[PDB]
Amino acid sequence: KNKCVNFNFNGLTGTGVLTESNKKFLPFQQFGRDIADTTDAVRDPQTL
């Protein structure tokens, strides 16, 4: 965390700085999106 890394979540590849989020995902929800249809928040497939 807190480092710019090449992250790969279930094929959702990208590059960013993964940090602690204060969003409230619903249990079914898997990942978020930005207005530009780019991922903004994800759920770790190993640790929910």
Place this chain on the structure above:
Amino acid sequence: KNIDGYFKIYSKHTPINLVRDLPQGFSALEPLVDLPIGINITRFQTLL
């Protein structure tokens, strides 16, 4: 709803104080399950 043979269920439970009909208000239904049955369904029935 059955889209491409995938049975999606969205469910929600809210309290009311009424005996007449569907109350005025707004509430959304969180998705519950996906059943990959692949069945064409055209008629149904509820069970009391």
